[PDB]
Amino acid sequence: RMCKDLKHLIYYRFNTGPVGKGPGCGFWAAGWRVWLFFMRGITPLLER
């Protein structure tokens, strides 16, 4: 849900101006952060 949140955060700043709707936005650092912080927590679970 959080990554979708960040998509809504990023796209609606990305798709302003002459940029319209479309699949061209990639500012991937926010979601990539979120999934790495998930990997931080489940690394010792899957390791155990």
Add this chain to the structure above:
RNA sequence: ACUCUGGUUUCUCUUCAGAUCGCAUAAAUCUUUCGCACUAAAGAUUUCCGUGGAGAGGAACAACUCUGAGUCCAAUUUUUUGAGGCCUUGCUUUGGCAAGGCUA
């Protein structure tokens, strides 16, 4: 204005760290609370991601910038003079002292 420290980088270990150890943020478990728990909150513990400090060990090139330490004044106002000489008493430790008056 002459001389002796201390370096910096990197790899690793050990210990302390409730300090935004992290200008970022996970997960598990337990307990509590209400719902009726991914869509929910509290408290606590733990594990992870991965820090600062100190100590130690290796190995790479810099070695005295830095942090330190050991290492030109005679004219009013101070350090280039108002300084020296005479008289009375108390005692003379008979050398003279103390006070006052002087004279320059």
